[PDB]
Write a protein that binds this ligand. Structure first.
Ligand code: SF4
Ligand code: SF4
Lengths: 533, 533
């Protein structure tokens, strides 16, 4: 016989376990009507603008409960290292600064990703993408966020869009008369740690699957600001269907899934292997960015059906800028997920001063006296440059032009600033993944620059070779707390070169008491070699 | 100050360049009505069953023009190798056998993928997925197709579903009153060659991108039945958005895109780099499965916007079972893409006999006298076993049980048969990707079995090592032509062990004049080591 069985069978398909708050007066944009015997809902498209505006505004200032609980868990656990409690407190204190509705929680305000489920009898006019984008356009223009989207004029010529557009508008056709949503402010670092592996039947056994998890979790590293929300998907009907599942699973969108499969190949969570992923994360010693136990907040494992020959595997994380918001529109109005507004209640209840107001050769001498893992406090001037800045500088040296003088005077800060609020010295200004500028380290160091670099995440072995060769260093900043570094450490920000690039321009900043860890010294040591071998 | 710009702006968004055919009397399933001043369309949900039925039935017997043109181009091109013209003729002859509406073009009838775009005012009742699944359920139940889906009862315990369900129903919400579709019969092998790479700005330059394409195209190998439809996507708003684009790009779904970018980051095809991908494919010498020029039919390259920190890259192919069908439902009725029904017009106007009815050691002696690249014709008995059959045998040997004697008598054929037509000796019965059973070659050969293996695609270096140690061989069949091997070569099919596995049971077949190439000999030679180094 025939029996239809949906792949995803969530016992809470409308997310009732989430607390919502209705926008004041939002019932003027909806009207319940009846057509041909069926109840419909007439939605003013201006409601989609309001919803995307409020969603992509508040999500950069508040977090969910399960995200804040994980930070408190890293502080109150006796088994957490001193670095775990240090990073967890720095992020929680950063979460309190962001709650002021002025600074975003992280400088990477991220890509706007909208998963919309429009009912068959939910009528908006059809221009949902135009109206949702306008709400997103207001969120990033009129608030101290950052334009992070890069348009391609051809295959290689790029420019910023100036409005954090386009967005990923994944609008689906679902039954009913409502309009359910899921807004995601996916950061760049956590989006780059969405890995796709094509596997076989040989993987599907407890011995090989655990070894797979042990092997692949190390590839995440600390380049996406742990503690993570590790998501793992085994199987799938296609590569994109697996990567979409692991993306939503990282947002706890599929938590209501069953925990047992049937003869119809339904999706299900496997809590047994969720605990196994957490055991591998804790035993790894990678910890919260700088060694410890709390490498991950929690794990979600989903087992999907597969073809007899195919077995794709998805692995993705949610960074410390865990930014998702559930929402829906019905006859009552616009309801949007309520996020925790008082993060201070989750807060319970050894450093070395380094001044960069010297010749950089004198700063290099001081850093050489301390081993990897030493906590340092930078006080001086930094030169900020990232992906596009490094790419242009290399093209100058390939045309005979010299290495610019700003690359040699001060340490290099891999960072991209958000917009500065009125009356503030600097907007959110946190570090960026260092590993993306690894191919420029040896080249720039052999030309008398980039001796000291300040960023976030583990770097490749070629960088340690270049540092032990040219006598350089790599300082590892706490990745994540961009708001507290703006209101405390950074005192002055000035543009230096390439103002056409927006965030990715060359900046000169003056910092005070900037926390960082010595990750790579001039002797060939890497503080991540023990845990990320 | 605000301007909305969709990412994908195809100049032919309704696919007018495609030839459609109206189902007779299909206008009885639609009724055009007007509500609140806007014209809507009421669609009987039974129309989705009829549409999915005809789509997933006819697509397994006919191909598009550009796929058949690539085969003819591989025969008449002077620069095509003798093996290119041999494989291209074998596939063309297979398309004519499949055109008989009895045998499917390939034994892997694939996963049913449905991309539906339901209009805002297109009313079907909401149960679109239930009715679409029934149409797919009828296509694979009542036609000589194959149940290829594997349900997971838990994390490791698996069983077949018996109906090639579930499907991937990606139903989107689009403006209007129509219902546009794209049906895909995505095979397992080509779905496993959908690769995701997370890259950086360092890749975005002509020197690095060319080296990237050269390096990554070799990793595809021949395990997905070339000539390919190579699709490459640079950038994207997320990993799943990149992998979805490269799949649709492989189906020529985005051919109508512009060829230039703007300050708004719209998607566009880059024909310049499409020719560069074609130049890399032809100059690679990989050719149509066994060395030559036609490694790919054509290339599609799409440049997507990206975040300043993100740069995902998608690479996927469409195998020789290029199976996609466009369709839509409007006030006129049900329209479905017209595929070429007479493929013979595309066909323009010494082998080594090997007898397998001997001791397998005597067959090994004969094959040892010939080098790699020798084309052989198998005449005897083969033992058919695949992913789950190999997996169960290994767990038996891990419990102390011996390697079953049927693994030692005859060569092992990595294949999974489709359903047998009434009065036919065997349904479509082509080879599967060999590289997925590579971990069993050395183990099984040390127990006196699996000395000769017959499948498709290049294998890992551990297989070449195991052959020079245990004196084994690996014959590479022409991957793709499953229909012509059923009506000509295969004479009898009998189940031998593990009938619980359905398709993936252990089969004993008697073939006659089975074409194959000696890929790995007992001396450490690999005919793919030169092109896939
Ligand atoms: S810098 Fe860290 S917290 Fe911010 S978006 Fe990137 S990975 Fe997430
Ligand atoms: S066997 Fe070859 S042609 Fe058939 S589905 Fe697999 S890759 Fe495609």
């Amino acid at each position: 016989d025939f029996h239809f069985s949906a792949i995803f069978q969530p016992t809470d398909p409308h997310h009732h376990q989430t607390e919502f708050a209705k926008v004041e007066g939002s019932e003027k944009y909806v009207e319940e009507v009846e057509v041909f015997g069926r109840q419909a809902l007439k939605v003013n498209p201006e409601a989609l603008t309001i919803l995307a505006h409020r969603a992509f505004s508040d999500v950069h200032h508040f977090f969910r409960k399960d995200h804040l609980e994980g930070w408190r868990r890293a502080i109150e656990d006796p088994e957490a290292s001193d670095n775990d409690r240090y990073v967890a407190t720095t992020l929680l204190k950063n979460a309190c600064i962001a709650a002021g509705r002025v600074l975003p929680s992280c400088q990477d305000t991220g890509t706007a990703i909208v998963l919309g489920k429009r009912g068959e009898l939910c009528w908006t006019g059809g221009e949902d993408e135009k109206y949702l984008s306008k709400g997103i356009w207001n969120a990033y223009r009129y608030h101290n966020l950052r334009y992070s989207q890069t348009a391609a004029l051809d295959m290689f010529k790029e420019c910023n869009t100036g409005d954090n557009l386009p967005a990923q508008l994944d609008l689906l056709a679902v039954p009913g008369s409502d309009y359910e949503f899921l807004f995601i402010a996916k950061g760049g670092g956590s989006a780059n740690k969405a890995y796709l592996y094509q596997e076989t039947k040989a993987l599907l056994n407890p011995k090989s699957l655990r070894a797979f998890i042990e092997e692949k979790l190390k590839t995440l590293g600390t380049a996406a600001c742990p503690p993570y929300h590790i998501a793992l998907v085994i199987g799938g009907t296609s590569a994109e269907m697996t990567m979409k599942t692991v993306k939503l699973a990282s947002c706890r969108y599929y938590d209501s899934l069953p925990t047992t499969g049937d003869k119809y190949g339904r999706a299900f969570r496997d809590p047994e292997w969720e605990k196994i992923v957490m055991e591998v994360a804790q035993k790894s010693g990678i910890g919260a960015q700088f060694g410890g136990k709390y490498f991950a907040h929690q794990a979600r494992v989903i087992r999907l059906p597969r073809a007899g020959a195919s077995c794709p595997v998805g692995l993705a994380v949610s960074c410390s800028a865990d930014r998702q918001i559930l929402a829906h529109i019905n006859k009552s109005g616009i309801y949007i997920e309520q996020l925790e507004q008082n993060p201070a209640q989750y807060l319970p209840d050894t450093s070395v001063k380094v001044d960069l107001k010297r010749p950089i050769d004198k700063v290099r001498q001081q850093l050489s006296q301390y081993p990897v893992g030493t906590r340092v406090m930078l006080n001086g001037t930094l030169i900020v440059a990232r992906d596009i800045a490094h790419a242009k500088i290399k093209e100058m040296m390939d045309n005979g032009e010299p290495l610019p003088e700003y690359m040699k005077t001060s340490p290099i800060y891999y960072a991209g600033p958000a917009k500065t609020p009125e009356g503030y010295a600097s907007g959110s200004f946190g570090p960026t993944t260092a590993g993306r500028m690894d191919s420029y380290v040896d080249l720039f160091q052999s030309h008398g620059g980039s001796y000291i670099t300040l960023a976030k995440g583990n770097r490749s072995k070629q960088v340690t070779d270049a540092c032990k060769k040219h006598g350089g260093f790599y300082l590892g900043s706490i990745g994540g707390p961009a708001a507290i570094l703006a209101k405390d450490s950074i005192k002055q920000v000035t543009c230096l070169a390439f103002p056409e690039l927006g965030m990715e321009a060359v900046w000169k900043i003056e910092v005070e008491d900037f926390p960082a860890f010595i990750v790579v010294d001039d002797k060939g040591n890497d503080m991540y070699s023990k845990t990320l071998a």
